[PDB]
Amino acid sequence: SEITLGKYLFERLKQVNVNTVFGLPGDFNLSLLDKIYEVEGMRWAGNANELNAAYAADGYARIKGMSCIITTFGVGELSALNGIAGSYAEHVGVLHVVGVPSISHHTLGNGDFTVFHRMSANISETTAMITDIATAPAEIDRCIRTTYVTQRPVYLGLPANLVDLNVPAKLLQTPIDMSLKPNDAESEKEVIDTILALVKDAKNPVILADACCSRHDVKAETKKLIDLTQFPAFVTPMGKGSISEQHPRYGGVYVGTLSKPEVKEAVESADLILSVGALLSDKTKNIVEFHSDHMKIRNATFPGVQMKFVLQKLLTNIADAAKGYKPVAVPARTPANAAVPASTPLKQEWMWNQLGNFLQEGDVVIAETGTSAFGINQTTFPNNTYGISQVLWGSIGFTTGATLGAAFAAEEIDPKKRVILFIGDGSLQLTVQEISTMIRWGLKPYLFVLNNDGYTIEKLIHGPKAQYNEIQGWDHLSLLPTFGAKDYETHRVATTGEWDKLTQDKSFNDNSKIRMIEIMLPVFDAPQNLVKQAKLT
Amino acid sequence: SEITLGKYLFERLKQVNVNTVFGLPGDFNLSLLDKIYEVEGMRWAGNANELNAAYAADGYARIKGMSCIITTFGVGELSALNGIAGSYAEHVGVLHVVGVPSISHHTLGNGDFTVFHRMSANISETTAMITDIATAPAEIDRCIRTTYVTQRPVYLGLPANLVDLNVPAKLLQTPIDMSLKPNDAESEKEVIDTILALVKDAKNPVILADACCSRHDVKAETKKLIDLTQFPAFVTPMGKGSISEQHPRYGGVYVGTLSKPEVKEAVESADLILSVGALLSDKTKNIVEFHSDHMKIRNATFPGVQMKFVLQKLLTNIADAAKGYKPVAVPARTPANAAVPASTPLKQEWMWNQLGNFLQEGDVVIAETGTSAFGINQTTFPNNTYGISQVLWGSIGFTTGATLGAAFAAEEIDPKKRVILFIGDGSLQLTVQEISTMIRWGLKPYLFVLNNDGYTIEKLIHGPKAQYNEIQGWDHLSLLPTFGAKDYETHRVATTGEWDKLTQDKSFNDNSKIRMIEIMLPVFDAPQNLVKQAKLT
Ligand SMILES: Cc1ncc(C[n+]2csc(CCOP(=O)(O)OP(=O)(O)O)c2C)c(N)n1
Ligand SMILES: Cc1ncc(C[n+]2csc(CCOP(=O)(O)OP(=O)(O)O)c2C)c(N)n1
Ligand SMILES: [Mg+2]
Ligand SMILES: [Mg+2]
Questions:
Q1: Strand partners, A128
Q2: A111: left (phi over 0), alpha (psi -120 to 50) or beta
Q3: Cα distance from A113 to chain B (closest Cα, Å)?
Q4: The cross-link Glycyl lysine isopeptide (Lys-Gly) (interchain with G-Cter in ubiquitin): at which residues (chains A, B)?
Q5: A514 and A418 in contact (C-beta within 8 Å)?
């Protein structure tokens, strides 16, 4: 019994729970594409562009675990590189499948069929050009396993002839191994023992969860490590959402010198740091760095000890190792907004603080690079909030495509999960078309547009009234109907009373339809942290 | 007097007549952008996105001769690559300046600042990463020179700390030399002698003007060749616009089996083909191919013989060598559309035939990849008409970007000149935001959108009713008002009498404002030949 290699692929993605496929049709992938519709439960999004399709595959991967985008040779694959590069930089598992010319137009005119391939290799964890149907199955399995486990994009070139070539159906009965290989027994024990020893003598331990605590599936574990030790817990901007914020031991968002003094104080105060961190983007010497494929304890490095299994194993013992810890007070949460007359103009500072009152458990919150990304660090999330902020890549326009991906993924996990976006008016312009795809599928994201007339974050760094920091003023509330939305809602908010009246409304709170909210704000208005950050940069 | 390095760039650009710069602001280019406003005659377009800006730079360059696009490290340069690759593939001189960090966010997280430079090197004629002020001026010059002479994209990396360093203003007093190196004397002598020999014995010789007849300077040399020999002249789809279609010796568009039969026969029966600037496609014996960097006679190649020198010397003796020529009749041009009831539904075979009545000398006509680019080949142009058809690279949203760039370039040449776009409903989606930039500058193109509901060129070849060939339906006429347009016109056309009524109107024929014309066509409708090819496939 046999199946086409083109259907093998889609069957493998169904087994890994990639049910939606991103990308655009083109000359070299039509026969692949046809196979999606033969796989019950699969769907082709129909993106408005390849860049947008990649931003989307990122959004989807962030939520569901992995994603797949399919493009066509030359023209499709090159348009998507900015998305791909960003998933590499932030450790998002995206499988980029490119439909290429059959073994032997949309070329550079020099007979070089490997150039686009070479370009991609610089931003892929691994790459594969399928040449033989004999190894082909094993190559797809490999690419899929690797995208999953390293959480990095992988490139797979598939010649048009092969797609319709047959393979043994039987191969689908054995699942792809999607799990981490166990740790070296001995090094793993030494790490565990050393950490336990350190916890025993620390008087003021602190936990700090960054990017990779989320990106590398360790949130249930970090979460329980806090309950078992009662140590103060801080998150960085990229890790925001990694830790439940209504946890009585959550201390806030640590952003170094830019940290609200007590946070700065409580963190720099520690005699022990358990960093379920990330990069060396930049107290004591007593730091434990937890990393996806290695540990570091003070100056000691332990290559290939995976944090997943050390964390799991520490949970069985840590409590008795910390039986002796006297709980230090955690910095108080920022107080609620003092009541004001309904006619008070909306200001960012008041907004970000007030937003914690509309959010709910299970929401997915996306903030674009600009004032939005700075502001969101000032909002307190209900527990179980998934935040998306591209702090490291910082490619504006990313959130519209990502919102599409997260809504698709969220629709699949639970139809009640709300997807909320905060996007600058300047950023929207780069990827606005993707809204069209939201409409087509009946997804219902909350799209909040920050109308402040131009590039505020840029104006705050350089050239406040410079022509290049200014944009063409669009009629945003007409966007929905222009893209053929039938059932949607549009709102404009400019004061605190409009903010409250709208966000406390019962009906508004249910994701029953797609909605756009235009936020009227002053030009030089920004959250305290951007006011204080960028000022210096 | 001494000036900034950043200002020096823009004064050189203006010396080679680039008055509009494309791109988007970012973290590493703000200080360079400041320099554009210190230079009289220069303008920052303010693009809605980087891919769209690359496409515009391409269209600007096609018109003016060269262009410049400025982006920012990582996020910005990566987004433009599909545009840059197209300019490389089709020989369009685009200079891509990228603002880079300071020689000390938006990286892959690995400390490697060269990865992006390296990626672009594969789609660039040459590349430079400036690092020394003492050498900078010469490097800027070299890159400008190379872009202009090779008619291929160049990558120029400019650290933000250098653009503010001073250089002697006296440098701009000695212009960049665009002179070409002479050819190997014996190879060139050999080519010239052989071509004149072939011409002498030819009974039915024809001229073929292809793609790089225009971007490569030879349009003048080519016309003199026609006048001097009286040989019938044909263009290929990529060279349309290169020969004036009202010339008595012009015989048509040579497509393959797709050409008009009278045209297919006329070209195919020639005993000598003089092919100028071929990137090509294509009984046909004696084929002389003129290329910018090489000649080809029959099967023999002469690497290094530049067509430029060969054409100029041939124009001195060609009339002698062809003096025995007895003028063959050129194929007769397509007869006017027969009269039909005003009620008749719009069909493409009819429309492309009818469009020639609307065009005027000096027009700029752009056609997107899809049915429009197949159809345009059936249109008869008045003299001095520029055609833009991205035949080889074939990147579907290219034309909305191209249009903005040809509109700015035309404006600088002569504001009375019209820019006319033919785009499918499906391609507009990938690049629709760039209509916004056209509005901001008060540019006034004719934007004709072919609404045939989805991807008909692909439906004609594979999956006539495959979901991946359909698209979300948009309210096309609401795009202008959604983007803040103030002075504009919108129009819908569905029948023959509607076409005529609009296009014969005198106010309509005047480019007093931006216009959008939506054309309703049947889903499987296309140029006939295209439809017939289609079924035997
Ligand atoms: C693709 C890309 N191009 C350019 C930039 C540079 N950039 C960073 S912030 C910004 C302006 C964003 O404006 P807006 O979305 O209006 O946010 P605001 O600060 O006004 O809320 C720009 C152009 C980038 N990060 N990525
Ligand atoms: C950037 C890119 N992505 C995908 C394609 C594949 N492609 C070629 S034509 C086409 C559809 C063209 O649609 P439309 O513009 O509506 O044309 P028409 O209906 O007149 O054929 C697509 C998706 C491409 N050429 N370039
Ligand atoms: Mg803004
Ligand atoms: Mg169409």
A1: A156
A2: left
A3: 12
A4: 203, 224, 260, 313, 465, 486, 501
A5: no
Which sign does the torsion angle of CA B314, B319, B325, B329 carry?
Answer: positive
Compute the distance between CA of residue B94 and CA of residue B58 in angstroms, rounded to an integer. 7
Cα–Cα distances (Å) from B530 to A270, B332, B372, B480, B523, in that order, read 74, 21, 11, 32, 14
Give, as one character, the DSSP assignment of residue B345.
Answer: B
Q: Which helix (H) or strand (E) holds B424?
A: strand B419-424
Residue (of B132, B34, B37, B25) closest to B73 by Cα position: B25
Distance from C-alpha of B33 to C-alpha of B27, rounded to nearest angstrom: 11
Q: Give the other-Cβ count within 10 Å of B168's Cβ.
A: 12
Could you tell me the resolution of this structure in angstroms? 2.3
**Which two three-digit tokens encode residue A146?**
């690797």
- As annotated, the active-site residues of A are 27, 50, 105-106, 394, 425, 452, 454, 458
Determine which residue's CA is closest to atom 6 belonging to ligand 2: A26
- Asked if B432 contacts B421 with a C-beta cutoff of 8 angstroms, the reply is no
Domains detected in chain A: 1-179 (3.40.50.970), 180-333 (3.40.50.1220), 334-535 (3.40.50.970)
Backbone CA torsion sign across A426, A427, A433, A437: negative
Breaks (C-N over 2.5 A) in chain A follow: 104, 282
Chain A partners of B395 at a C-beta cutoff of 8 Å?
75, 79
Strand order in the sheet with B419-424: B386-389, B364-367, B419-424, B446-451, B514-520, B488-493
Annotation-wise, does A457 bind a ligand? Answer: yes
Using the mean position of ligand 4's atoms as its centre, give its distance from the Cα of residue B102 in Å.
46
For A437, phi then psi, to 5°, come to -70, -30
For CA atoms A342, A346, A348, A354, the dihedral sign is positive
Task: Report d(CA A520, CA A345) in Å as an integer.
Answer: 9
Report which protein residue has its CA nearest ligand 1's atom 3. Answer: B76
Closest residue by CA, ligand 2 atom 4: A26
| Rounded (5°) CA angle A479-A482-A488 | 65
Q: Name residue B21's beta-bridge partners.
A: B44
Closest chain B residue to the Cα of A439, Cα to Cα: B472
The Cα–Cα gap between B37 and A408 comes to 45
Helix (H) and strand (E) counts for chain A?
A: 22, 21
Query: Which residues of B are known to be catalytic?
Result: 27, 50, 105-106, 394, 425, 452, 454, 458
Question: Which residues, other chains included, contact A225 with Cβ-Cβ below 8 Å and sequence gap of 6+?
Answer: A207, A274, A276, A311, A314, A315, A318
User: Measured between alpha carbons, how far is residue B148 from residues A280, B7, B154 in Å?
Assistant: 43, 20, 10
B251 C-beta neighbours (distance < 10 Å), count: 26
Please tell me the distance in Å from B81's CA to the nearest CA on chain A.
Answer: 6
- Cite the DSSP H helix spans in B113-184: 115-120, 136-150
Contact A15, A362 (CB under 8 A): no
As a dihedral over the C-alpha atoms of residue B379, residue B385, residue B391, residue B393, rounded to 10 degrees, the angle is -150
Residues with CB under 5 A from ligand 4 (ion): B 424-426, 452, 456
Give A40's DSSP letter.
T
Helix, strand, coil % in chain B, rounded to nearest 5: 40, 20, 40
C-alpha–C-alpha distance, residues B523 and B409, integer Å? 35
For the four alpha carbons of B121, B126, B130 and B132, in that order, the dihedral sign comes to: positive
State the number of CA atoms in the 13 A half-sphere of A442 facing the CB.
4
Closest CA to B139 of B91, B171, B100, B103: B171
